[PDB]
């Protein structure tokens, strides 16, 4: 009997592991890996990974002049340390997220992505194995647009809650999008569901159908799963990134998972072509009319920014230990 | 038997009437008047003002080619018709709101403001008597910045919920800001007059302006009740709905000065800057969940009132075409 995990892969979905705990992911045989500020913070606290934090702290000490510069450099190196280790375990790519504090700064986001890519190159990792992960604000989408076409740097568009964001991303020729399933459902829940009626599931289906109808090459990676019913409803979608607990539930089970989403079927549901990438006021207005997406994007940026500030303090403490000892 | 309303004026606050019902406002002897989408919709539904709506519809029918253009032109004329009548009643200014659907479009907001001013000029109204009301997005603030310095067009910055927006507005040299008192309190409630977060926010803004010598007028807006009002007595201006004005007109309850520039100066925080740094403004505003969510919803709400006015005008335009 085939595990639920293998059945998902057979249904046509690539499995992606959402964790910084790279030691824990290999048994699920994921294709790619994703990290984000919450996951990096969590992993950075684990005593077993102390040597990677130490290496990052030494790096930051070397390159910064002010303690602030030292700390910020070290935080960059932490992302790359974990990413490099992950790439030893997965055959595909790792997603490394641009500082969320830069979500409203296109120029700074482009420069940060270029810097992260350079650090990977210095570590012997080619840019083809990296997805630079960027919040799906107007500025983030435009940053990705530049990185993809000007630099050949592949981007993963995250904190994506709306069809409006997804259209803009497709037009920007981004490599991959990560529409959030669970957080969409969270909003309308407060204002639970069956999988067929789940607003997050319906949103991702709409985005998928559109991409496939109009022939956009951008990969769709469903993200932020709350339960296996959401997952089962989207089986067949290009990629899913999943937390370790849900991977373990799929791994241990033989419960059936069959194809639900496929390009040939979904094409017929795709809505008529629209456009946003060239009209900033129109994008901002239409996005603003989506209360859920506006509020969840805004909150996601604050949450990830708080996780980065927590990482900063963790690094400050270690940097001090290094200086003293 | 000095009314509460009169004591408010004596406390140093200019009283502004928040209403499109211009026949109802003279009783309170307001200095200025404010209108917005919600109020314009409400007054347009009143039968005593049918002749002004008819005039606006006739105007739209003349200038538009498509029905859409006719309706949109009529909407502009409705705003200007009411504003023109208000200016016969009040000695001071009228606030007329730029299409909230343009809140994220600096260029279109500037052009719309220029158009409204031209329409007022056509009606014989001098531009110094008009305040162009603009939502306090980054785009709106930059639009106001241009209107003030390039065109000498005076702006009233609305949907203002944060110190961040207030700083940018002062640096942009805007004529007036309208910080919302009640909606700020609404968020955090979901308080005494001294602990009311709306009151504290407005006091923070007022103190900052006065300490640093910014000439921008502070008009506290969006009151729920008299407790918030009394805590802010002495502030430059308050815009008040007819129900609150009536309450104050009929009441004898005491109102004394609480806010003045000389006392407030001492509470003002250190000078900061936002007007020249778009990413910084956007990041810091986004860190203020209340302000972000209230600005966002305020734009949706005013956009909904414009769509409702559109449908009212559409129906009249059809009646005019048919009959």
From Swiss-Prot, chain B:
Query: Which reactions fall under this protein's catalytic activity?
Result: D-sedoheptulose 7-phosphate + D-glyceraldehyde 3-phosphate = D-erythrose 4-phosphate + beta-D-fructose 6-phosphate
One GO MF annotation is: transaldolase activity
Q: Which InterPro entries match?
A: Aldolase_TIM, TAL/FSA, Transaldolase_1, Transaldolase_AS
Q: Which residues form the active site?
A: 133 (schiff-base intermediate with substrate)
> Which pathway or pathways does this protein act in?
Carbohydrate degradation; pentose phosphate pathway; D-glyceraldehyde 3-phosphate and beta-D-fructose 6-phosphate from D-ribose 5-phosphate and D-xylulose 5-phosphate (non-oxidative stage): step 2/3
**Entry-linked Pfam families:** TAL_FSA
Q: Is DNA-binding one of the keywords? A: no
Q: GO annotations under biological process?
A: carbohydrate metabolic process; cellular response to oxidative stress; pentose-phosphate shunt, non-oxidative branch
Keywords tagged on the record: Pentose shunt, Schiff base, Transferase
Gene3D superfamilies for this protein: Aldolase class I
Further comment found in the protein's record: Present with 1920 molecules/cell in log phase SD medium.
Record text on subunit structure and interactions: Homodimer.
Q: What does the protein in this record do?
A: Transaldolase is important for the balance of metabolites in the pentose-phosphate pathway.
NCBIfam families per the UniProt record, alphabetical: talAB
Identify its protein family: Belongs to the transaldolase family. Type 1 subfamily.
Name recorded for this polypeptide: Transaldolase NQM1
Q: Which organism is it from?
A: Saccharomyces cerevisiae (strain ATCC 204508 / S288c) (Baker's yeast)
Which gene is this protein's source? NQM1
């Amino acid at each position: 009997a085939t595990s639920s995990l293998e059945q998902l892969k057979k249904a046509g979905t690539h499995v992606v592991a959402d964790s910084g705990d790279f030691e824990a992911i290999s048994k699920y045989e994921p294709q790619d890996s994703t990290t984000n500020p919450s996951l990096i913070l969590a992993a950075s606290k684990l005593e077993k990974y102390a040597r990677f934090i130490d290496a990052a702290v030494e790096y930051g000490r070397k390159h910064g002049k002010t303690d602030h510069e030292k700390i910020e450099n070290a935080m960059d190196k932490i992302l790359v340390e974990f990413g490099t280790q992950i790439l030893k375990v997965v055959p595909g790519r790792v997603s490394t997220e641009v500082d969320a504090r830069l979500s409203f700064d296109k120029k700074a986001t482009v420069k940060k992505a270029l810097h992260i890519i350079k650090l990977y190159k210095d570590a012997g990792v080619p840019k083809e194995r990296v997805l630079i992960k960027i919040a799906s604000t107007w500025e983030g989408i435009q940053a990705a647009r530049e990185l993809e076409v000007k630099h050949g740097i592949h981007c993963n568009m995250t904190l994506l809650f709306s069809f409006t964001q997804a259209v803009a991303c497709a037009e920007a020729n981004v490599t991959l999008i990560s529409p959030f399933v669970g957080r969409i459902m969270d909003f309308y829940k407060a204002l639970d569901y069956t999988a067929e009626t789940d607003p997050g599931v319906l949103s991702v289906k709409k985005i998928y159908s559109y991409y496939k109808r109009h022939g956009y090459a951008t990969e769709v990676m469903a993200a932020s799963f709350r339960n296996l019913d959401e997952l089962k409803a989207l089986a067949g979608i290009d990629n899913m990134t999943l937390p370790l607990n849900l991977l373990e539930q799929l791994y241990e089970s033989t419960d059936p998972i069959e194809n639900k989403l496929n390009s040939e079927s979904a094409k017929e549901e795709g809505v008529e072509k629209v456009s946003f990438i060239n009209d900033e006021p129109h994008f901002r207005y239409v996005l603003n009319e989506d209360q859920m997406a506006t509020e969840k994007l805004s909150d996601g940026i604050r949450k990830f920014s708080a996780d980065i500030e927590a990482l900063y303090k963790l690094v400050e403490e270690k940097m001090l230990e290094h200086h003293h000892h």
